[PDB]
């Protein structure tokens, strides 16, 4: 402490108009002694000014935590613009700097995949319905559920993980009751990603 | 400034099979080149244990160095909770560190393994995916591998443990392999070790379907 | 003088990582005269400090037993690690020492088969269930019954038997209801074994 933590837009803000992305900055270990922090940011070397910066919040551990959040335009985000956080502390021997950006490589787009539940698994009284998501670059994704039009909320999802070929998959678990399993209810997995056509796809699964 | 400790448990795979050695690693960073020796004392339940395994200092780009010592625990102690102490002294500390490491607690939960065919979209690529779902495990440690015939197979990777709704865990192993080999009827397995399998050790399989 | 006896570990303790294998020194005809008794300890030549030394018992013929307890990990053990104990006592010209390890040779790999019970044990109110192990090296091993999940402990193994080619072979008897085996139920012998994959296989056994 203080030490500086950059966290990049949300996979979802990036991708849809709807949505604002912006990368924040974080200053933790703030000491009492020592309670002023000054940011500067730059996008791609440029100082700009339009960062919204909170007042310091009290920490249980008797420290500072102090964050500040840059609006960042959806285009530059992707295009893989440069975003620079500079924390000033008295102290710091000197000031803390930080970069982030969209990771480089070419955009790879996912491959979606619904798996039913194993033949086992059919004893038990809810199922999992399996969504694998494979050879996307880069990592950035969101993965939803449906039924019917609605959203379904008992799911859980891996994060990405780095294939031998250089992209990423992961496997999203919803759980049903095997009673609307059976029944022949159909249920979509809905995948967002910025290599996909209008950022998003959609793969549906119901008993076969 | 000053040196820093890093006290590392077993690896899953050690601690459950009989003929591999389990270790708790002490890591001490940042020691200088002034003062770049290392005294560990070890503690198993607070009573020191002599069969600590010294390593040979690394040194590392920013001109200090890395410097290792490793514990064989037994596998039963491990797994009965055994508390493992490293102290660490160095002429540069005031005084020694001193870290604890020990197995998570909490009741230990059996994991339930399900092997899934490829999807049916995929058949038409030249390579297909296998996939192990194993779920309502605890704790999170637990290794997980693919054979084929009896064989170890090794395009295989393996998500890290994700915590479910109700506080087990559950990951997926997908193993890639040739159509032609899926296509051939050969029977591909996920086996996988936990602390709370009897044995320590179950296996699913997976081949063609008529 | 003084009499030295170094016990092997217990089989089934190296196979099960839950138990404890422990190499025994056991010292008899200790005087009365020259009670003191010294125990050094050697994994591999290396001097080891996890002895547990027992207090001396008096016998029956007025003189002491000595006992001293090293545990061994279990790796060492089956890798094949050499233990030695030295015993010094005022009464010896020189210390005793003794060495033990595991049985050398190239491991043999079990072939593990079930047979159902033979046509004429039908008429008895219980069946034999028996699972045959063979071509096994060393002789170490561990065998058990499961049903469903379950384990089933109405059965008796005979300890391994030496075979013409080297390789020892046993049987396992598991003694169930006649019912249960005529309802179809899945009875499992599970052997243990340190040449098996994984250490570890299984075989079924069901109404054909
Ligand atoms: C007082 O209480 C506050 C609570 O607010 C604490 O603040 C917390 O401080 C934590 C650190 O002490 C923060 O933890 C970080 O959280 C991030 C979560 O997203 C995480 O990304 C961070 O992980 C990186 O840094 C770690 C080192 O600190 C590494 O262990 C870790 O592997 C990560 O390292 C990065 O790895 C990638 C590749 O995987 C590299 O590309 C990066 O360059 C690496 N980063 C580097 C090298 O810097 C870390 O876990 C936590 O966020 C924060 N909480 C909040 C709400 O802000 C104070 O610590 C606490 N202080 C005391 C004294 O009690
Ligand atoms: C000094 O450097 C050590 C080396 O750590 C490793 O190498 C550097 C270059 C990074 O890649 C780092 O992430 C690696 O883990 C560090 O162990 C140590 O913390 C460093 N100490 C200081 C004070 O910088
Ligand atoms: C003295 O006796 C020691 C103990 O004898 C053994 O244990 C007792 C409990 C009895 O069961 C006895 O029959 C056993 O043989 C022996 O270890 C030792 O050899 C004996 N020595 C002499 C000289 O008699
Ligand atoms: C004091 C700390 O502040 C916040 C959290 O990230 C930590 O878990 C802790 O509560």
Redo the contacts with the bound molecule.
């Keep these: 402490?203080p030490?500086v933590?950059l966290?990049p837009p949300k996979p979802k803000d990036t991708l849809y108009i709807t949505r604002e992305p912006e990368v924040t900055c974080?200053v933790?270990?703030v000491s009492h002694e020592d309670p002023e922090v000054k940011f500067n940011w730059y996008v791609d070397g440029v100082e700009v000014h339009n960062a919204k910066t909170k007042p310091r919040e009290e920490?249980?551990?008797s420290?500072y935590?102090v964050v500040s959040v840059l609006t960042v335009l959806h285009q530059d985000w992707l295009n893989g613009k440069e975003y620079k956080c500079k924390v000033s502390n008295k102290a710091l021997p000197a000031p803390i700097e930080k970069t982030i950006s969209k990771a480089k490589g070419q955009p790879r787009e996912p491959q979606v995949y619904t798996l039913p539940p194993s033949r086992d698994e059919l004893t038990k009284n809810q199922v999992s319905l399996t969504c694998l998501v494979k050879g996307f670059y880069p990592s950035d994704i969101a993965v939803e559920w449906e039924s019917n039009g609605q959203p379904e909320n008992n799911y859980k999802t891996t994060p990405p993980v780095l294939d031998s070929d250089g992209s990423f998959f992961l496997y999203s678990k919803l759980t049903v009751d095997k009673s609307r399993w059976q029944q022949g209810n159909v249920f979509s997995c809905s995948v967002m990603h910025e290599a996909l056509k209008f950022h998003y796809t959609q793969k549906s699964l119901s008993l076969s």
Excluded: A, L, P
């Design positions: 402490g030490s933590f966290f974080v933790v270990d920490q249980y551990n420290t935590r």
